[PDB]
Give the backbone structure.
Amino acid sequence: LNEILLPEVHLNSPIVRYKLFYYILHGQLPNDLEPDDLGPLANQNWKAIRAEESQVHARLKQIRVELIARIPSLRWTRSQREIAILIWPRILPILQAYDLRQSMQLPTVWEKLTQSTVNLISDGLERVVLHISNQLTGKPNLFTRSRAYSIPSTRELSQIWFNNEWSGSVKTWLMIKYRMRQLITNQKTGELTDLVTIVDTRSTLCIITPELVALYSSEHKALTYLTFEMVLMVTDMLEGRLNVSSLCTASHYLSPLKKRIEVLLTLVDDLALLMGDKVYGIVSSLESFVYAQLQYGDPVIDIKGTFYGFICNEILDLLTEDNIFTEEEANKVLLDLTSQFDNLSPDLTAELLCIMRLWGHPTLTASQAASKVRESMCAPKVLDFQTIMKTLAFFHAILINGYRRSHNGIWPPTTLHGNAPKSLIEMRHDNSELKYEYVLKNWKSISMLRIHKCFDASPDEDLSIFMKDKAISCPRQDWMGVFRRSLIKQRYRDANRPLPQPFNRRLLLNFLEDDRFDPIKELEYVTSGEYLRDPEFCASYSLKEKEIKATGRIFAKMTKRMRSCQVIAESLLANHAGKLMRENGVVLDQLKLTKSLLTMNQIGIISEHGFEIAACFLTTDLTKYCLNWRYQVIIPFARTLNSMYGIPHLFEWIHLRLMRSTLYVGDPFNPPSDPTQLDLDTALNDDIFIVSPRGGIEGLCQKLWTMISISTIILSATEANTRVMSMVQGDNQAIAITTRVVRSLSHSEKKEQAYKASKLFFERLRANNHGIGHHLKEQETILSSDFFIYSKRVFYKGRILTQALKNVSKMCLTADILGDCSQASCSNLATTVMRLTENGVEKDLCYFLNAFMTIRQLCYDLVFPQTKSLSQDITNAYLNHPILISRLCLLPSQLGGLNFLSCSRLFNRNIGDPLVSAIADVKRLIKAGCLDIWVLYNILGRRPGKGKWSTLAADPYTLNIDYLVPSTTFLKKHAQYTLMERSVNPMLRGVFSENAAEEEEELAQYLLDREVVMPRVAHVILAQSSCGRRKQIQGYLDSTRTIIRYSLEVRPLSAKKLNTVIEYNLLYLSYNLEIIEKPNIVQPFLNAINVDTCSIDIARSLRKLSWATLLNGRPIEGLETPDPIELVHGCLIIGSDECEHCSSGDDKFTWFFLPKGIRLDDDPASNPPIRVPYIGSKTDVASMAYIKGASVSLKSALRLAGVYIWAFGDTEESWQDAYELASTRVNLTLEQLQSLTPLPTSANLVHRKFTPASSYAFSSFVHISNDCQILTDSNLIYQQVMITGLALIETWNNPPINFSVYETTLHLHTGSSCCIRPVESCVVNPPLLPVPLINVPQMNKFVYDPEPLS
Ligand SMILES: [Zn+2]
Ligand SMILES: [Zn+2]
């Protein structure tokens, strides 16, 4: 079992300083730590602690005596020796000193294997991309126009990735991490022998232990100790540095950033050595300085350089805070730090926000983390009553207006106070729109307005909320169980009290193993006030991982009942009250969100092609808002929400419970300093305790706070008589103040006028925020006439800045997920490469990088085996033949390979048929020479796998090939099944059944075993049926690492299952060895397929032979979709050129036009008019009866019936067959089912954070016209063609290029192509099989509704 629950490969936990201190002091390791540094650990009785844990102490003593023997000088005390013991933050400038190059062969073998494999496919990939450019533009310089400098191929990429700086460091820390993970795994199994590893490299001695490593560098005479989390963090940071430096070296776009990033890294490493853990304040100041430098180019003189100067002052304060540097040294350091950000384009100035994670993370202490929140929270705060009531009145107005525009424009049930004026009387009587200008006046009457019950909201409305695992704290009596037993044993022995019981329960497991669960009775915990009277309640903080800022270093955890009430209340707020606010543009659809943000940023840019429209953008972060929320400023809003929802007392729970409870920071190695503090309630407001908190907690009750902030923003906007559009995000907000200026004014003067108009709004907003208790400092406020910040992305002058280096920094050598398969890692690398394509990096370079890192990952997995195997035949066969490695890496993942990035994926996110794209890629590789035609013949002639009807129906477009599903998803499904099997919750009484797989197989066979097989129709019908609903509910579980471990423990895997999960990688490699080794003998009729055959025909034939066992010769219809690159034969027209396809026969094309004279980040009058580009089209029914408030079951049944009738026929027998599959989810009869069913024609057949598809730099000025074309598959095809054309236009002028001196026209002639085929459907398809006996959860509300109509 321990071979699956391997130690994590990447950092996921905070670095605890006291853990390392505990390990160092346990074995009496040499150190120069002051008594103040040790904190509470100095007064611990280490004799007893060493008496226990004797294996740990024995290992530590062994490494100590090895250190003494190797370095005799370490015995000297009082720091009179020449060797200095350094803790993690002070070893940054000496990371390159640790080499271990000798007595280390695995990294060298890995590098040699990667080079040998890459050397075989570089030219083929160059030919592939050349052919792609020739086919998509008609010219061979599509990808090389912006660079022509130097074109990096795959071999060049490998050379500059393995030969640059940090490469040796990455190899030596990868070996160290691998050895330490091996030692940890051995220790878990109880081997107890040879658990100390010594490498003893010349000038660098490293000793590896399952607990910590001891690294000594002779060149610098510095010895350091690193725990496992520290080692993971160091190797992750080194890998990120390697990726960033190599990408800067490779891409011409990021070339200027290389030297600046290197100089910044060196400067901050020296600063870290000189300072300690206080250099991460400087790192955060640099994070803010990126935006300060962005604001330095603002046209307005009054707003240019303010943030720059403030951030410089903050950096100087941080530098001179502890008197490490004098004024002149701090000034020189500041100048050196700032000189790396000057003379950079706005895109690059935002791609220096990648270096935040490049210096690791600070060593956290519970006391320091608690100090910040205790300073912010638990503080007196004076609040303005008038501001509170004005905000409440505008809250009422916004809620009323949001209830209007829906519900037939009818006012909610409201009660008017006695001093409402006649105008309010008539407006309530009339039910007209409450004008904000009207609400500003008579605010005393708009307030004191009781809004009665509006929604019949039910806590159990959403089921997915209850299925998400959340951390839950121990009761108030076991609050000391979080700390290590060794540290608290002496305290509990002195006090003569029993040791606290460790707490390991989870919220998800408590919910699932709850016999009597009901949200109606669960909310009574808060409604009846039992939470205030609960003595067991205990809320505690815990250190947050991968956090460098002082704020947000802790996240809180609460008891099971309180957490359940919190999630129920948040869901209640978001479902009904949250939807009423449309003043902010937040939507659950990302496409609409980015369109709204693009329009908001493009408000200010108006071209010459009266009074124009001008915008000034204001962005403020709300991270510190949670600690500053007070009960008095939220009581009226929450009271009105209570009245609206009908629950007498549901909200205001966080503050009321917090003022009566004592909070603490729970860290296993950070016990309270005072050994006499054995109880939480009587603790003092110091150390790790936060006595009587009066503020909020981050994330908790975020919806109410966001609505209050929206009301405040609206109030401020109306107070200054300025038009704004808010976009509050919870942790951030962006405001665009709108004003009307003269058209003839110069752009600088229009911006000045906009800023002058926005000054009053900003003053009113600051005054209102101060009134409600949120003081706005210069840190929070960034005023810019060009850009605003949303979702950590900068919207600069109608674009979105790239930040591709931030994406490339997290491209590591192994997925942190459980299975750790080669396929999962390759998929992660491909996803990161897709992000790089979207974020401005060269598409050709991204393709080469994806191939190179796929090869590198496979070589790493081959030469760094996670689990030792008795038979190494497969591993040796792959290691000795790099051509096999190349063939496997270049083969698409749909055919069994590890190439998860298709050629067409480089241009459009949406892919119709993955198999067609895979076939097109294989044909391209065969034409270039990367692969061989006999590989394609072997794939065509491959023996069908062990597939059933269920796998064909559940996941269409997939061939019958074994080992296409990684062991990771198998582990996730096993965890979900184990959770379902032991579940006893009433809400899931009938979800789980033992014959679920049999029922799914029978239904899939019924839907598929017909005259014509329709995998999409079967997939949709299965998903919308009862069994599909049960599968969805079972898949609602999160299946985290803890959940997977619990499932493996309570339900152990069989020996055969254990072995196959362990050796999935070797089994997959051996399975693909049958096709990537030698030309197999295939059937003679397969020779008809050639490299010139259309990918659609090849895909149809491959699906026919692959599923030959299941179908016995029947063809598969409804899946094929043209490959976007192969479908279109584009031509680019520059100046006097003409389209060859237009002049020769073809007359179908998608017209793309780019005007001339465009210059980004320049005068808006000069360039052609700007507009929101085409980012995509989502779902957008004419049913006989428009049922309002229809349940999910009713909609699912209606869609199932419609799809069945549309696909299998409109005969009465088909209607009876679909009646059963509809009645498995509703209680309709045939007549109501037929009447209520939507129109059964043109079935969509569609079924299954902020990542924009592009920067939209040059796609905003483009002109499109699809008039000369035919025009829901055709709509998807045309949308894909449009997106591909936009991507082609964008890559024609890469982010290195910012001007277009000539007008360009793109045609993308989709005609005269073999992939265009007529679409035929709606034929008669008799069932051919009796309808299976389906068990339906009649009593379950979330699957079946006995009353689907009112
Ligand atoms: Zn043309
Ligand atoms: Zn074709």
Q: What stands out?
A: The first helix runs from residue 17 to 26. Residues 1131, 1139, 1141-1142, 1149, 1307, 1309 surround zinc ion (ligand 1) (CB under 6 Å). DSSP finds 52 helices and 22 strands in the chain. The CA atoms of residues 522 and 564 lie 8 Å apart.
